[PDB]
Every structure is written in C-alpha cells, then in structure tokens.
Amino acid sequence: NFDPRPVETLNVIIPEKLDSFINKFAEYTHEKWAFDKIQNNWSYGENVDEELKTHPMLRPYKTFSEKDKEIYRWPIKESLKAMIAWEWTIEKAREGEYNPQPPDLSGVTLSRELQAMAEQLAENYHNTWGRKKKQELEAKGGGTHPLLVPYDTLTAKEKARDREKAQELLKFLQMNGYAVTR
Ligand SMILES: [K+]
C-alpha cells in the first residue's frame, strides 16, 4: 500500500546566496540535455518537430527568457527546499573545482553519508511523483500504476532514475565546494 507524503516546500525559503548555484546547476542540466540531443543530431528549430529533430531550446541557456530558465531552475529549487525542510546545512566550504560541452560528473565520488542523503532525496522524488500520479489517475477516471508502491519496495532498476537525480545534485554541489551535512 502506498500513501506518499512528499515534504511540504511551499513556505520553505532558499537563502539568497544559493541563487548563483541554482543558475549554474540549471545551466548544467540544460547543457547535459542539449549535449544528448545534439549527439542524436537534433538542431535548433523554431518549433519542436520529432520528424525533423528540431527543438527551440537547442541554444545557450544564457539566451533564455526567465520563463525558460525557470523550466530548469524550478526542479532544482524544489530539491533544495526539501533539503532545507529536513534541516540539512548547505555551506560553501571551499572554492569550486551551438556546441554544449557540459562538465563530466563521472569522476565525482560521494561519501557514504552523502550517498545516504541521496536516498532520502530519491525517496522524496518518488513520493512527489506518486502523489501527483494518484491525482492524475483520479482526474482521468481512476486506475492504477505498478510503481505506486513505497520507494523501499522498488527494485534497484526502478530506483535508478531517482538515485541518479539525487546524486547529480549532490555531486554538483560538491564540485562547486559546498558541504552538505545534517
Ligand atoms: K548552455
């Protein structure tokens, strides 16, 4: 049985001094996506077109409106607000380390303790998805979904996407010299 309760972020305020990290990481996530698109021969085009493989977001993050940057910044803000909600500390302890070439995060090793923190983030992403999914199903007439179970009961394969998202955030924080502790 599954009763997902993602942490409540609505009144959680991110400190001003994280705004710079938020934009850098948003730019990173856009570049990564763009890089993968371009490797499959997508190119800029005014419209999204699956036959022609064009996408209007295939251009520099720097050239976006605030609305389009927000596509990438929103989910990062939601992750940071969950961490702040859980009373984790995020502090800049050290100095940090169209043709997108985003940094490679393959070589970033997270401590066991940060990997443990990634599990709480992943479970929260799963609970956010599961709560939204229950609403979506009810709005459409009812029905079910095989992943509407507690995160801990998921298979390793089923957990991967939420683990990868949680690891990417914690790796980019580390790379930019942030210590994350609880
Ligand atoms: K970019």
CSV table of C-alpha atoms and ligand atoms in Angstrom, one decimal:
chain,number,residue,atom,x,y,z
A,1,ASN,CA,0.0,0.0,0.0
A,2,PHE,CA,1.2,3.5,-0.9
A,3,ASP,CA,0.4,6.8,0.8
A,4,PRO,CA,3.1,9.2,-0.5
A,5,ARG,CA,3.7,12.3,1.6
A,6,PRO,CA,6.4,14.4,-0.1
A,7,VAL,CA,7.9,17.0,2.1
A,8,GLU,CA,6.0,20.3,2.1
A,9,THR,CA,8.1,23.0,0.4
A,10,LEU,CA,5.6,25.8,-0.2
A,11,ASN,CA,6.7,28.1,2.6
A,12,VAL,CA,10.4,27.0,2.6
A,13,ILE,CA,12.7,29.9,1.6
A,14,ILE,CA,16.0,29.3,-0.1
A,15,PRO,CA,18.7,31.7,1.1
A,16,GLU,CA,19.7,34.4,-1.4
A,17,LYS,CA,23.3,33.2,-1.6
A,18,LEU,CA,22.2,29.9,-3.3
A,19,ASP,CA,20.8,31.8,-6.3
A,20,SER,CA,24.1,31.6,-8.1
A,21,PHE,CA,24.4,27.8,-7.5
A,22,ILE,CA,20.8,27.4,-8.7
A,23,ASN,CA,21.5,29.1,-12.1
A,24,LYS,CA,24.8,27.3,-12.6
A,25,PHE,CA,23.2,23.9,-11.9
A,26,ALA,CA,20.2,24.9,-14.1
A,27,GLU,CA,22.6,25.8,-16.9
A,28,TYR,CA,24.4,22.5,-16.4
A,29,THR,CA,21.2,20.4,-16.6
A,30,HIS,CA,20.2,22.2,-19.8
A,31,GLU,CA,23.7,21.7,-21.4
A,32,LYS,CA,23.6,18.0,-20.5
A,33,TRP,CA,20.1,17.6,-22.2
A,34,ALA,CA,21.3,19.7,-25.2
A,35,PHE,CA,24.5,17.6,-25.5
A,36,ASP,CA,22.5,14.4,-25.6
A,37,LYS,CA,20.1,15.9,-28.2
A,38,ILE,CA,22.9,17.2,-30.4
A,39,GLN,CA,24.7,13.7,-30.3
A,40,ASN,CA,21.4,12.4,-31.8
A,41,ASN,CA,21.6,15.0,-34.5
A,42,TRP,CA,18.9,17.4,-33.2
A,43,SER,CA,19.4,21.0,-34.1
A,44,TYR,CA,17.8,24.4,-33.2
A,45,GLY,CA,14.5,25.0,-34.9
A,46,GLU,CA,11.7,27.5,-34.2
A,47,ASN,CA,9.3,24.6,-33.4
A,48,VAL,CA,9.6,21.2,-31.7
A,49,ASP,CA,9.4,18.7,-34.5
A,50,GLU,CA,10.1,15.0,-33.9
A,51,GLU,CA,10.4,14.2,-37.6
A,52,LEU,CA,13.0,16.9,-38.3
A,53,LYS,CA,14.6,16.6,-34.8
A,54,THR,CA,14.4,20.4,-34.1
A,55,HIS,CA,13.9,22.0,-30.7
A,56,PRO,CA,13.8,25.8,-29.9
A,57,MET,CA,15.6,25.1,-26.7
A,58,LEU,CA,18.7,23.9,-28.5
A,59,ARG,CA,20.6,27.1,-27.9
A,60,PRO,CA,22.6,28.6,-24.9
A,61,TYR,CA,20.9,28.8,-21.5
A,62,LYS,CA,22.2,32.3,-21.4
A,63,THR,CA,19.9,33.3,-24.3
A,64,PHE,CA,16.7,32.2,-22.5
A,65,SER,CA,13.9,34.3,-21.0
A,66,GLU,CA,13.3,34.0,-17.2
A,67,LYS,CA,10.3,31.7,-18.0
A,68,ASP,CA,12.5,29.3,-20.0
A,69,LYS,CA,15.4,29.3,-17.4
A,70,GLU,CA,12.7,28.5,-14.8
A,71,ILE,CA,12.0,25.2,-16.6
A,72,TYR,CA,15.4,24.1,-15.3
A,73,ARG,CA,15.5,26.2,-12.1
A,74,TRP,CA,12.1,25.0,-10.6
A,75,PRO,CA,13.0,21.4,-10.0
A,76,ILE,CA,16.4,22.4,-8.5
A,77,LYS,CA,14.6,24.8,-6.2
A,78,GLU,CA,12.2,22.0,-5.2
A,79,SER,CA,15.2,19.7,-4.3
A,80,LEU,CA,16.9,22.4,-2.2
A,81,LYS,CA,13.7,23.3,-0.4
A,82,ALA,CA,13.3,19.6,0.6
A,83,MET,CA,16.9,19.6,2.0
A,84,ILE,CA,16.2,22.9,3.9
A,85,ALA,CA,12.9,21.5,5.2
A,86,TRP,CA,14.8,18.5,6.6
A,87,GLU,CA,17.3,21.0,8.3
A,88,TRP,CA,20.3,19.9,6.3
A,89,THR,CA,23.0,22.6,6.1
A,90,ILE,CA,24.4,23.7,2.8
A,91,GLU,CA,27.6,25.8,3.1
A,92,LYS,CA,30.2,27.0,0.6
A,93,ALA,CA,33.2,25.4,2.5
A,94,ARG,CA,35.7,25.5,-0.4
A,95,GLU,CA,36.5,27.1,-3.7
A,96,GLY,CA,34.8,25.2,-6.7
A,97,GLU,CA,36.8,22.8,-8.9
A,98,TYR,CA,25.7,25.9,-30.6
A,99,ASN,CA,28.1,23.4,-29.1
A,100,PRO,CA,27.5,22.4,-25.4
A,101,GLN,CA,30.3,20.6,-23.6
A,102,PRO,CA,29.0,20.2,-20.0
A,103,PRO,CA,31.3,19.1,-17.3
A,104,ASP,CA,31.6,15.4,-16.7
A,105,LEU,CA,30.4,14.3,-13.2
A,106,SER,CA,31.6,10.7,-13.7
A,107,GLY,CA,34.7,11.3,-11.5
A,108,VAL,CA,32.9,12.8,-8.6
A,109,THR,CA,32.8,10.4,-5.6
A,110,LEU,CA,30.2,11.0,-2.9
A,111,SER,CA,30.9,9.9,0.7
A,112,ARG,CA,28.8,7.1,2.1
A,113,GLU,CA,27.0,9.7,4.1
A,114,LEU,CA,26.2,11.8,1.0
A,115,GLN,CA,25.0,8.6,-0.8
A,116,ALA,CA,22.7,8.0,2.2
A,117,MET,CA,21.4,11.6,1.9
A,118,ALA,CA,20.8,10.9,-1.8
A,119,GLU,CA,18.4,8.0,-0.7
A,120,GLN,CA,16.2,10.4,1.2
A,121,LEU,CA,16.1,12.8,-1.7
A,122,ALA,CA,15.3,9.9,-4.1
A,123,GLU,CA,12.5,8.7,-1.9
A,124,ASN,CA,11.1,12.2,-1.8
A,125,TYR,CA,11.2,12.4,-5.7
A,126,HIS,CA,9.4,9.1,-5.8
A,127,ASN,CA,6.8,10.4,-3.3
A,128,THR,CA,6.3,13.6,-5.2
A,129,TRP,CA,5.8,11.6,-8.5
A,130,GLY,CA,3.5,9.1,-6.7
A,131,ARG,CA,1.3,11.8,-5.1
A,132,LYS,CA,0.9,13.7,-8.4
A,133,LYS,CA,0.3,10.4,-10.2
A,134,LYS,CA,-2.6,9.5,-7.8
A,135,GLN,CA,-4.1,12.8,-8.5
A,136,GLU,CA,-3.7,12.4,-12.3
A,137,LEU,CA,-5.3,8.9,-12.2
A,138,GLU,CA,-8.3,10.2,-10.2
A,139,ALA,CA,-8.7,13.2,-12.5
A,140,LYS,CA,-8.8,10.7,-15.5
A,141,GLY,CA,-11.3,8.2,-14.2
A,142,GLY,CA,-9.3,6.1,-11.8
A,143,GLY,CA,-7.0,3.2,-12.4
A,144,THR,CA,-3.6,2.1,-11.1
A,145,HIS,CA,0.2,2.2,-11.8
A,146,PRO,CA,2.6,-0.6,-10.9
A,147,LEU,CA,5.1,2.0,-9.4
A,148,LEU,CA,2.6,3.3,-6.8
A,149,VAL,CA,4.5,1.4,-4.0
A,150,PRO,CA,6.9,2.6,-1.3
A,151,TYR,CA,10.3,3.6,-2.6
A,152,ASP,CA,12.0,0.9,-0.4
A,153,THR,CA,10.0,-1.8,-2.1
A,154,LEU,CA,11.1,-0.7,-5.6
A,155,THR,CA,13.7,-2.8,-7.4
A,156,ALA,CA,17.2,-1.4,-7.9
A,157,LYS,CA,16.3,-0.9,-11.6
A,158,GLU,CA,13.1,1.1,-10.5
A,159,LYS,CA,15.1,3.3,-8.0
A,160,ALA,CA,17.8,4.3,-10.6
A,161,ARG,CA,16.2,7.4,-12.1
A,162,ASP,CA,15.5,8.9,-8.6
A,163,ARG,CA,19.0,8.0,-7.4
A,164,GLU,CA,20.6,9.5,-10.4
A,165,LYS,CA,18.8,12.8,-10.0
A,166,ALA,CA,19.7,13.0,-6.2
A,167,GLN,CA,23.3,12.0,-7.0
A,168,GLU,CA,23.7,14.7,-9.8
A,169,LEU,CA,22.6,17.4,-7.4
A,170,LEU,CA,24.9,16.4,-4.5
A,171,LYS,CA,27.8,15.9,-7.0
A,172,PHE,CA,27.3,19.4,-8.5
A,173,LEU,CA,27.1,20.9,-5.0
A,174,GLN,CA,30.4,19.1,-4.0
A,175,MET,CA,32.1,20.2,-7.2
A,176,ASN,CA,31.1,23.8,-6.5
A,177,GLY,CA,32.7,23.5,-3.0
A,178,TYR,CA,29.5,23.1,-0.9
A,179,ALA,CA,29.5,20.9,2.1
A,180,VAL,CA,26.0,19.3,2.8
A,181,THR,CA,25.5,17.9,6.3
A,182,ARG,CA,22.6,17.1,8.5
B,1,K,K,24.2,26.2,-22.2
